[PDB]
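User: Predict the structure for this protein chain, please.
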Amino acid sequence: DLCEQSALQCNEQGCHNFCSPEDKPGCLGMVWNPELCP
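Assistant: Here is the predicted structure, written as structure tokens:
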């Protein structure tokens, strides 16, 4: 959903805005990894 989408499409904003505080690190912390989204 919007949360997953923020991981998949590399959206820091969404990773804070759409994802919950639990998924937040899971999403953003993952997205911020240049191995996935440089």
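The two ends are 22 Å apart (CA to CA).
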